[PDB]
């Protein structure tokens, strides 16, 4: 049940759990979407990060359009609580907890 990423067909990250392992494929189980696992290819598999954040910096951010996910964003603006984001290239007004450094871990 080791837990993963895995990058959606939509270019986002989506939290998930390791199930299986195959030659080819893995095959995860998601977050409330557990239930069809997909089964996965390496490559489109990466590991949650371990355990600064500041402007203009590049982070991920935790949307959607849908299940919610990781999506990359640049922090243009901060101020009080409220980060003024970008992600091809809407905005939006965040906080601290929609966020985090880009995980820069790496696909299989």
Request: charged share 30%; net charge negative.
């Given at each position: ?8 067909s ?12 195959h030659?080819?494929?893995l ?9 069809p ?5 390496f ?11 500041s ?37 939006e007004?965040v906080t ?12 299989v």
């Amino acid at each position: 049940e080791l837990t993963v990423e895995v990058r959606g067909s939509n270019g986002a990250f989506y939290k998930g759990f390791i199930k299986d392992v195959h030659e080819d494929s893995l095959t995860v189980v998601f977050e409330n979407n557990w239930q069809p696992e997909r089964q996965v290819p390496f490559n489109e598999v990466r590991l949650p990060p371990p355990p600064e954040i500041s402007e203009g910096d590049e982070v991920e951010v935790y949307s959607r359009a849908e299940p919610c996910g990781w999506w990359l964003a640049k922090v243009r603006m901060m101020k009080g609580e409220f980060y003024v984001i970008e992600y091809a290239t809407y905005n939006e007004i965040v906080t601290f907890e929609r966020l985090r450094p880009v995980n820069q871990n790496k696909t299989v």
